[PDB]
């Protein structure tokens, strides 16, 4: 769990790299087909949800 937040999904693959969690979430969103502007613009709301 600690690894996921700090390093996202990168550590399982190899040595962990530190990335911002907000940025990490954005990368996952792209996977689902939603651009990054959507996550950042609605970032305040998403945290609450």
């Amino acid at each position: 769990l600690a690894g996921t937040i700090t390093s996202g999904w990168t550590f399982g693959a190899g040595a962990a790299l530190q990335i911002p969690f907000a940025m990490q979430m954005a990368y996952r969103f792209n996977g689902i087909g939603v651009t990054q502007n959507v996550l950042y613009e609605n970032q305040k709301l998403i945290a609450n949800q």
């Binding site: 911002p20 907000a22 651009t35 502007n37 950042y40 613009e41 970032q43």
Partner: peptide, 25 residues
């Protein structure tokens, strides 16, 4: 580019360069 600069958090002032303008001038 999709928005206003105020909405995003942690955005840093910087200059973005366009290749097209130089050639036009």
């Amino acid at each position: 580019v999709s928005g206003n600069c105020d909405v995003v958090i942690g955005i840093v002032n910087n200059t973005v360069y366009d290749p097209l303008q130089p050639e036009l001038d």
